[PDB]
Design a protein around this nucleic acid. Structure first.
Ligand code: K
Ligand code: K
Ligand code: K
Ligand code: K
Ligand code: K
Ligand code: K
Ligand code: K
Ligand code: K
Ligand code: K
Ligand code: K
Ligand code: K
Ligand code: MG
Ligand code: MG
Ligand code: MG
Ligand code: MG
Ligand code: MG
Ligand code: MG
Ligand code: MG
Ligand code: MG
Ligand code: MG
Ligand code: MG
Ligand code: MG
Ligand code: MG
Ligand code: MG
Ligand code: MG
Ligand code: MG
Ligand code: MG
Ligand code: MG
Ligand code: MG
Ligand code: MG
Ligand code: MG
Ligand code: MG
Ligand code: MG
Ligand code: MG
Ligand code: MG
Ligand code: MG
Ligand code: MG
Ligand code: MG
Ligand code: MG
Ligand code: MG
Ligand code: ZN
Lengths: 174, 207, 38, 141
RNA sequence: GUGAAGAGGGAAACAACCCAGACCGCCAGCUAAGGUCCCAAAGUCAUGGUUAAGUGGGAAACGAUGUGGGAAGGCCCAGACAGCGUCGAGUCGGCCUGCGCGGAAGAU
RNA sequence: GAUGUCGGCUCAUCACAUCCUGGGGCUGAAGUAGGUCCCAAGGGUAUGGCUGUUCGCCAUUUAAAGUGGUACGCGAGCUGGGUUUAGAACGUCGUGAGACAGUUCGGUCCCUAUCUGCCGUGGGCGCUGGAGAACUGAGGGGGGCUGCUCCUAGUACGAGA
RNA sequence: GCUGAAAGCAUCUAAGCACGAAACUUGCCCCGAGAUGAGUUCUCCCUGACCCUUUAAGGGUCCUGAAGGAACGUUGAAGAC
């Protein structure tokens, strides 16, 4: 509603292909594709995209708020990109990259290998840090959740794969 | 694919390390492709094989013409094998026991030995009732076959007396002990279904 | 997870959310306060 | 005496129906009606006066609400414990013509004539039928 | 009051409930209860609403930003509520009430 | 104008309020191992001593020795120890015959299956000229348990254990 | 869990997307076209004349008798039959 109210700015570089509902945006980093909900109009004019509820769709306004949120993401992301950073924490918890597959050693009896998706790429600045980069806020978030889920931060020492940004609630054992 | 062979019998192979391997000897003579089935004509991909030899007079005109179309001598029967994506054969091509040279494990399908009408003790491993302690005429009999008015019937698939064996049986994942192109022999470790002289289907192990 | 007929905010940080037709209490602060109506 | 239709003289036509987008049950009532011959003035309760109907695109039949996931088809195998189930979406995946067939069969009379009526329904998952020889007229349901 | 000593139609089936009291015949007509998408006779009837639970087509104390209607309160361009010094129109929690939700485990 | 009754044996079948195995949330969860709640019915789920026992207690196992429904499943399938005929005795009550929600010893369990059902196995006709083969797979059934050891590693965890 | 508004925030959910168990559908084994919805493929076989009459998917005569099947016999690691 109020998210939908605020129209997303289209910068220079940031091509816009409206055709029914698909909103295919081609910036200079990359290119993105989203279908959209049948209760969303998209009115592109004046280097500026706008949203609103169409009739015969009670949810209408809610669907505009989601669609605006998704579009500011694709306007961002092919101009500046998205980045996410993870840390490893533990006795000998090493990360390593080898093309589009991240090699992790997270204290298993087997080396976990994580194949990054198409368009999501990654590099390790240390052995105990990982840096994901992409055009798409959802996929970079999903990949990082997949990495974190190998060895989730545990409640006593905070060991495992934290988001660098996150905080880990510790507890003293009984 | 697999190959059709005959159960010669059982024997052993003594290894150099002093192990005695029980073997079934399978005579796998040349399997001659009688018909190639394809997706266009038949709706599925397979080869029909024959093996062995049939008396000239006991081959019927309908059967003789089927063999005649292939350019193959009549054998003792016809069997199909489903093809994978990779495979192709031609009508008339012979396939020998050397197909199994690098195969480590086989499934062997035969017709089990016929036991005729078997009771529940033999057929289903039912327990006998008391030999003594007053048992009246009910030593190997099945006991109860249901409940009461609820449900007031016997359920389908109830284990009862009847025909036992003389049916198709596969035994899976038998180790190939030896292949011998020269004498048309495949040796597999352990027992396989069927009487001596019975037809066996041997395929590479699915598991 | 507490599975209860009566589910309710136990602190200031507890939040009611309906997920898949189930009333749930989630709580950022306390794992004990996480609830499911059932 | 009131007219009766006569089985050896009844005129039966061939029709073709596209099930794409049609609500299952509202399509099925119109099939069942026309298989029975309720649309004809010669309608006779003991005679099959209805028409042959081809149904195309049975895999694209629609259902409202959450029936695509939540509508369950139950059957028993006759063996104890043999209660089997499939959701509508699973039925669409494996045996898509059965969804329309099951729906129509439930709406036809029970007994020999009802079964005879059902034989005139020819349901196809695709957009092609093999019945060009019968010269199907397009029927808008 | 009905059954008993009462048929017919309805309530799937169902003495005792609902409608209704069978003198006989009719391949006429109108109604009752109850019904009118197909099984199965008759509205895929019209108009305006509610429900999204297959609720309808089992179950309470109690729980809940489900959703519709009504009457008041509070704060609010002397810039509210949220995110926060700023940013620009609503925002807050009760009351009543319609319809839904969870609470809801059983044996062929 | 009869629906055989406890317990056992044989054979089961279903429910899930789950005993084990599987998945998971919380823990006053360091690890190991527990507690509690949720999901889950695929399969699995002791032998003995005593007693008619079910049960229970006990011994020794097991991953576990689940809880219920099925005429407290199952005697036209078996048993007949309990119990409720006729014999006899004790305690007890009664003047007595006799009697006991007491005890004790002894004490006939029939049926050739017509129908349904179920397990097997044929004959008939059909399937559109007749015939011999090889098939496709709608559909149905079977199967689905789990211990211990070693490696990973005396590694993670822990003050150590 | 991700992204994500409705509800500027938050929120696994309303749109959208990912994961997740011996349960479910498969994969393994066996039956299986009476699956009357009776399916498919390959092969084999039969290529005479004539009459009758309410003329019709009609009823006979003579000639013909295939492929194949059965029957009988010797039998089986198949079987109550
Ligand atoms: K009366
Ligand atoms: K309902
Ligand atoms: K039981
Ligand atoms: K637990
Ligand atoms: K189970
Ligand atoms: K009883
Ligand atoms: K008994
Ligand atoms: K009986
Ligand atoms: K008996
Ligand atoms: K009967
Ligand atoms: K057939
Ligand atoms: Mg035998
Ligand atoms: Mg025994
Ligand atoms: Mg006796
Ligand atoms: Mg005896
Ligand atoms: Mg019954
Ligand atoms: Mg969920
Ligand atoms: Mg009827
Ligand atoms: Mg009387
Ligand atoms: Mg009456
Ligand atoms: Mg009635
Ligand atoms: Mg009228
Ligand atoms: Mg009608
Ligand atoms: Mg209308
Ligand atoms: Mg209901
Ligand atoms: Mg309620
Ligand atoms: Mg009687
Ligand atoms: Mg449960
Ligand atoms: Mg089971
Ligand atoms: Mg089940
Ligand atoms: Mg399974
Ligand atoms: Mg015991
Ligand atoms: Mg009983
Ligand atoms: Mg029981
Ligand atoms: Mg007896
Ligand atoms: Mg009995
Ligand atoms: Mg006794
Ligand atoms: Mg006496
Ligand atoms: Mg947000
Ligand atoms: Mg297992
Ligand atoms: Zn809280």
């Amino acid at each position: 509603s109020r998210v939908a109210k605020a129209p997303v700015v289209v910068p220079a570089g940031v091509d816009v292909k409206i055709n029914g509902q698909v909103i295919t945006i081609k910036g200079k980093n990359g290119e993105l594709t989203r279908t959209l909900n049948d209760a969303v109009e998209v009115k592109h004019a004046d280097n500026t995209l706008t949203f609103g509820p169409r009739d015969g769709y009670a949810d209408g306004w809610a669907q505009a708020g989601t669609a605006r949120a998704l579009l500011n993401s694709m306007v961002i992301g092919v101009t500046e990109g998205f980045t996410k950073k993870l840390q490893l924490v533990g006795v000998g918890y090493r990360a390593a990259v080898k093309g589009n597959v991240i090699n992790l050693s997270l204290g298993f009896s087997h080396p976990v290998d994580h194949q990054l998706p198409a368009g999501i790429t990654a590099e390790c600045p240390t052995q105990t840090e990982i840096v994901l980069k992409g055009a798409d806020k959802q996929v970079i978030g999903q990949v990082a959740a997949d990495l974190r889920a190998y060895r989730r931060p545990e409640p006593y020492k905070g060991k495992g794969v934290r988001y660098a940004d996150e905080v880990v609630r510790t507890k003293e054992a009984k | 694919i697999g190959l059709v062979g005959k159960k010669v019998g059982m024997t052993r192979i003594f290894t150099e390390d002093g192990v005695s391997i029980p073997v079934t000897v399978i005579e796998v003579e040349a399997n001659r492709v009688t018909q190639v089935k394809d997706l266009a004509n038949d709706g599925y991909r397979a080869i029909q094989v024959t093996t062995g030899a049939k008396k000239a007079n006991r081959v019927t005109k309908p059967e003789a013409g089927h063999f005649a179309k292939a350019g193959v001598e009549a054998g003792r029967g016809l069997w199909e094998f489903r093809l994978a994506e990779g495979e192709e054969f031609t009508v008339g091509q012979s396939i020998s026991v050397e197909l199994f040279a690098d195969v480590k494990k086989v499934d062997v399908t035969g017709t089990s030995k016929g036991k005729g009408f078997a009771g529940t003790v033999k057929r289903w491993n039912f327990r006998t009732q008391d030999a003594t302690h007053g048992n009246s005429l009910s030593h190997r009999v099945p006991g109860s076959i249901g409940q009461n008015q609820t449900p007031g019937k016997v359920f389908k698939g109830k284990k009862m007396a009847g025909q036992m064996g003389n049916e198709r049986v596969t035994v899976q994942s038998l180790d190939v002990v030896r292949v011998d192109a020269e004498r048309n022999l495949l040796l597999v470790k352990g027992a396989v279904p069927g009487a001596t002289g019975s037809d066996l289907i041997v395929k590479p192990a699915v598991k | 997870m507490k599975v209860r007929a009566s589910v309710k905010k136990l602190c200031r940080n507890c939040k009611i959310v309906k997920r898949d037709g189930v009333i749930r209490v989630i709580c950022s602060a306390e794992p004990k306060h996480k609830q499911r109506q059932g | 005496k009131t007219f009766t239709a006569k089985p050896e003289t009844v005129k039966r036509d061939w029709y073709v129906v596209d099930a794409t987008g049609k609500t299952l049950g509202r399509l099925a009532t119109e099939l069942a009606r026309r298989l029975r011959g309720k649309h004809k003035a010669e309608y006779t309760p003991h005679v099959d006066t209805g028409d042959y109907i081809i149904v195309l695109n049975a895999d694209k039949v629609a259902v409202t609400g959450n029936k695509r996931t939540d509508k369950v088809y139950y059957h028993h195998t006759g063996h104890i414990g043999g209660i089997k189930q499939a959701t509508f979406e699973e039925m669409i995946a494996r045996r898509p013509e059965r969804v329309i067939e099951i729906a129509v069969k439930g709406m036809l009379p029970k007994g020999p004539l009802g079964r005879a009526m059902f034989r005139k329904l020819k349901v196809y998952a695709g957009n092609e039928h093999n019945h060009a020889a019968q010269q199907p007229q397009v029927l808008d349901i």
